Amino acid sequence: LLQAEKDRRVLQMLRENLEEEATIMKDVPGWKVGESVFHTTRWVTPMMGELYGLRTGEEILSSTYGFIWYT
Amino acid sequence: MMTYIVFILSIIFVMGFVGFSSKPSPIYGGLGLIVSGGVGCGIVLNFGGSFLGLMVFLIYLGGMMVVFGYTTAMATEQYPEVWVSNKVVLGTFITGLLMEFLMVYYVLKDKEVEIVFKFNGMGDWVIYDTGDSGFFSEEAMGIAALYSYGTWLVIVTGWSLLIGVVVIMEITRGN
Amino acid sequence: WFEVLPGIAVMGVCLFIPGMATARIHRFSNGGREKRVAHYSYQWYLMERDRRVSGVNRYYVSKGLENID
Amino acid sequence: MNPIILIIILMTVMLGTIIVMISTHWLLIWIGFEMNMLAIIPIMMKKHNPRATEASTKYFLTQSTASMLLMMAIIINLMFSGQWTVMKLFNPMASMLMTMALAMKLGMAPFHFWVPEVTQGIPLSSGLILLTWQKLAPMSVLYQILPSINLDLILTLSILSITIGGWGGLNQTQLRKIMAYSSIAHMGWMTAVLLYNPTMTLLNLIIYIIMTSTMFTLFMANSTTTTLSLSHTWNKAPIMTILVLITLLSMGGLPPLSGFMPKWMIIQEMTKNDSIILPTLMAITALLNLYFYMRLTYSTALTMFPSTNNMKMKWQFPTTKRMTLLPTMTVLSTMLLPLTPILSILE
Amino acid sequence: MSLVYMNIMMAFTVSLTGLLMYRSHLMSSLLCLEGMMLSLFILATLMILNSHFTLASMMPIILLVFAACEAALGLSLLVMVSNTYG
Amino acid sequence: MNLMITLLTNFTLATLLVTIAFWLPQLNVYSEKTSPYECGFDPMGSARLPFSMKFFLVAITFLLFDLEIALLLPLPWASQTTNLNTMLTMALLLIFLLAVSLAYEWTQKGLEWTE
Amino acid sequence: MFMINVLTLIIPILLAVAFLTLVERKVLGYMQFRKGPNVVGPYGLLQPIADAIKLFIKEPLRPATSSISMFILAPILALTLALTMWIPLPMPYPLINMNLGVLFMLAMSSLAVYSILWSGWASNSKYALIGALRAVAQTISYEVTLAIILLSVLLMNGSFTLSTLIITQEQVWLIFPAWPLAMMWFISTLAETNRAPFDLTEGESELVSGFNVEYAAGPFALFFMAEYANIIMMNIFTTTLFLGAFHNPYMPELYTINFTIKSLLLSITFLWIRASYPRFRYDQLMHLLWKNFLPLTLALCMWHVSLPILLSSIPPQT
Amino acid sequence: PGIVELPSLEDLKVQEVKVSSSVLKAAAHHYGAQCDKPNKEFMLCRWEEKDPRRCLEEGKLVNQCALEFFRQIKRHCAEPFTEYWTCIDYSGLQLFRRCRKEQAQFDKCVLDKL
Amino acid sequence: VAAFLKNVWAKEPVLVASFAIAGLAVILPTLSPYTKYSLMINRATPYNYPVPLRDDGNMPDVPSHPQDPQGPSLEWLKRL
Amino acid sequence: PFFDVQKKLGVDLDHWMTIQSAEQPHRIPARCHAFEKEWIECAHGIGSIRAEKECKIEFEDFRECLLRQKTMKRLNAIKRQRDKLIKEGKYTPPP
């Protein structure tokens, strides 16, 4: 249960990143649509930098540095 | 809500050595190190290095620096213990490493690096852990693997230590 | 003979205050019940899950079986 | 000292170097260096005079910090695409710091500053064990990591070793120092060829070990720290001296003697590749070392002109001082040039 | 290579230049060496624990143990040098 | 961060209490300063010092025995694995090795403390 | 809310130090067959405030320090360590729950000696130097042994948590599974503090505490502070490690009470041991540790590495 | 170089299981008992093909199973389960050696009825 | 032997007893009957999710439904 | 002269801690594991002379896992447009 829930959450989050990126980066110097950067296209875990970003910066504190120094 | 604290601790850590390495006497040497090392606990811990950080907080801080300051205190006796000299190039390298360190934290836009050493890359964001593993340190279990898998490795270490004993006393002239 | 035992009593109040302090402050500030212990990443993950599903941002209110209804 | 403990130390030095050769992991090799230092500090200092203490220190600083720099390079390898193995380094920089590090481990041009000093400080046997045995580990590492070596560095360090280190020793009347600078020159060669055909590097390594072996062993036969001591032994007994001189010419690479063989093969596999100018630039300096050593060969003659040869020093009793394997290595470093089709046995 | 790596390297080289360019006090030399050694401990730790490569976590420990039994050797040679003169 | 606040406080109260302890005595009602203090001649307490190898050696053995101790420290994690044979073998081996160092140094002239 | 927790932790250990000094003077008094202080306040409860504000107010008194740095460093360090040592100690609840824990206390306890190196260093008196070096020597030598003991008695917990210790204690006090190692660790706790027998002294002796206890006035009320507070600690950490009570949740103050009682009684036993026995001469002390304690600790240790695998109970790391 | 494709937002947004870790722990023990026809299968799915976003459909399946599980415990045994997870939620690592009476009590309502 | 041990146990009981705890601590883990239990326990605690495999076209054992007994059974720990 | 005894006597010594893909204490995947698997799958039987040449693509893939130079630079490229569009409002979707 926790696994399915988690992975749905992260996929949702990454797609939201994709649409925001799509809105902001419309302009001439096109990198085109959101792409992997690897030469081989297959699933690779998110960086946790990719997921949490542009996020208001409050929950990157507790998510990235949160676990260390406990609650 | 700064959360650059890994980088602040990195910077103060550098500062310890920068302003540290000069001046003639070790008596402040101990201070400079122990400061920088405790900050090292800062770094390692802030990556979640908890045990390892505590080991540089036990062996190196306590064992090393205590034994150093013990010998220094025993070997040299300081009547004056003044402000001495030689710190000029240390502060001037705190300025050259202040606009050089501020050059690597300035040019950090996109990727920053140097033309002397290997490449670097830079920018303001930081990569870390996810993918929780239930009831694992990811570290201390590693050292449990030291005792399980580290057969040859603990052999060479321990042997090199016992040789440590016979060498040290042998040089202090038991005869 | 009894001279020392009042002093010992005062030492007893004096070392006994922080225990009741921290315990009651868990049982108050942290909700009705104890603070969670996050030592292992799994338990933290469950915490922040409770956090997200609380709607209060707090792991104090645990929701409950009927929250699905 | 105890006659056991020396066995329980030398055993650990042999062990350490064996680990540097055997292990496929970096951290191990780093440990092997650490053990060769830790256990090689007691061998030097065997007699308690202060010379061995200050000299053993100058060995300890530069040797240990060399080890640390090695660890730094290993770690930079970990940074760049990385795993712990023994194989081509994936960083050009890590390879740079590692060539410098292994350039301190064994004497090389910018880093050779300690070798003459420490070699004169410590006694004879420590002199043997310093200039031969500990010289096996770093080459055994370079043979491994050569694919990522930046050519320009090791070629440089080699030449500057030959020029500087070889050119040195001129005013030196001491022996241990001479053996040091010659060590740095043979270094310049062994490392010169290292990138082209390492077989020759191991060759000049082995021949070199035999050379310094008979040399120091003879210095144990006739206990001599100076050339004056050599002449005075010439009027005590001749044979040991002419062994010392002939082995010194073999240390100069004079054509009939066996020391000419590594130079000669190095010139083949050096010049079948493109550059012919650099080998000659080495052979010049090689002549320099030569006629220095042949100054040390006009140290002697018969119907001598006055050397002030003194007296008391005829003796009725032969010496029992035990020379371990002198003869086999004497003939083996004089007579070997009529061999070497045997070269390839080495690799 | 992030930033922290850059900075720790600069600490490393501060210690190293401090090693080579000051011969005055010997304890200071030996020290600077040891501080550099600490910096290596920090590097290997941060890296290994960054990549979650667990079986290799010894490199801080076993790298740190020779920070000592070698260093202790260092100080013993320091004492035996000092009692030559002073 | 929480324990870091505890360190910020606990460092304050140290600093504050120290400061109070310096102010009040030289904030006192009357402070008077006369007497000479002779650093002066070597035999006041002790004289000179010929620092002796014993104590230093105690620092040393404190190092080597530390190293072996911390090398032993992770064991409570390692006492449970799927290889028990090797575990017992090299834990008993390791601290046995510590005791070998001690036994050696206890056999030679080291320690013995009356010299 | 959190700083409330900090204050409630650290203020009562200071008050605990003052009234501790009171109980010390009294217990030694009657142990010596004579009443302790009655004439400061009723029954002696105003005695600490006397000692406190007076001993603060006596003027700084000597000498040129030669280091302004260390002189005002060492006291701050000694306190700060003595105050932060109390953090992990379990209580019903730790106030910082650390996974490692007990080896963190071990570690800071290892740092505590810089106050002795520096304190005794800045005297400018070449005798107080030597004294300090020696006190560092004995403190350090008993930092060797103690560590191994924790590294043994813990091995029945299965983890360092310092919380799970209270879980192991539920059925049987840890004093029973190993009494002897607990005995050696009690005497070890006497070591660092240098309570009698292990204390150095006045009259004719090394007089480390001669200038150490003399010098720095108010800051001597500090070294005073960290020493006694550190004592109360090691008593508490004994009470937690080698014994303990049952924790009934919903009513933690029960366990807090029982914990408190046993700890206080233990400290009482410190102060009356100090009354009881003479002092060891120095070498007989140091190589009394090297002679006998450390070997038997090695034996008991390896016997606790091999034991749990024998009986097939090896502890459950969570 | 290659451009990733991620499923439409509406490919997500399936269902909800909202409960605390505490209730989810013991209730988890029981459904892990009776459920796991779908979700083990799911685990050879995302384990065998591993590409989360490939198998998420079967994530919908497992979420379905757990959902209807909690539904049955809603309409079937309500109160005893409530007191049970509320006594297990006094937490301190939520120990199952703590509140036993309502473990046997809960399995007593369950077994006695369902 | 007997006199030697009586004398070393007369002089230095701490050291004799230390060697006793040592040696007995060495040998006893080999003999004692309970040894294997600890190993089988330690192996019986999963830290890592058991991951299923394709069933069809296999030799039947360790069956699907967790109640179906064919797999390993730690029941010996259930009552011990 | 690097010698191989440990393949001769048939004993593992350092082969366990050698690379990230080895069996872990309780198997936990390394961050970049799979790309180790493909880099060693590509470069296994070959001689590191032409492994340089032909395994380059997949190797660079592995590097881009480990160091994360390029992707980090990409996120940077996102904030660099975000910055100058704080002036010209793109507002925000998030809460």
Ligand SMILES: CCCCCCCCCCCCCCCCCC(=O)OC[C@H](COP(=O)(O)OCCN)OC(=O)CCCCCCCCCCCCCCCCC
């Ligand atoms: C001139 C001198 C100037 C300086 C003077 C200083 C005076 C005081 C010196 C003594 C005090 C040293 C204090 C060291 C604190 C170490 C804390 C630590 O290691 O905590 C361990 C803990 C492990 O957490 P864990 O339980 O694993 O996990 C929680 C749930 N996951 O870890 C955590 O929970 C994470 C905590 C991380 C917080 C950052 C730590 C920064 C430390 C900076 C130290 C600076 C001082 C250095 C020492 C100087 C000594 C002279």
